[PDB]
Each structure stands twice: as C-alpha cells, then as structure tokens.
Amino acid sequence: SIIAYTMSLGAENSVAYSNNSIAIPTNFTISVTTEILPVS
Amino acid sequence: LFNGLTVLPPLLTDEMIAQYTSA
C-alpha cells in the first residue's frame, strides 16, 4: 500500500580525513550524459 | 518576514537546506 516519507537527501558517506592523508585514483572512466534544451 | 488567497509551504525546508550546505 501507499506511504509518506521524509525526504532523504542522499546516502550518508564520509571522507577519511587526516592531516597526512590523500586519495589519488588508478583507473579512469568515460561516461556520457545528456542535456536537453529548447531552441524555438 | 482570509479571502481565498492560500500560501503554501515549500518542498525543501529551512532545515534540510541548512543540511545540504553542510555537505
């Protein structure tokens, strides 16, 4: 049946911070998106 | 910051918004 919820803004995550820490990748990626727009 | 004029609330809050920013 039907329901009503409070809106979750996204899934809690966190950035492991530390004054001597870093994050650098190893593998790239290519990802196509879209953007539809009017002209007339 | 009646006569049939209704004011509504928004979808997002003054609170949630303040939560988005924090992120």
Ligand SMILES: *[C@@H]1O[C@H](CO)[C@@H](O)[C@H](O)[C@H]1NC(C)=O
């Ligand atoms: C990079 O990602 C592709 C597919 O996502 C994978 O096939 C490839 O092995 C990855 N390379 C490394 C170095 O992880």
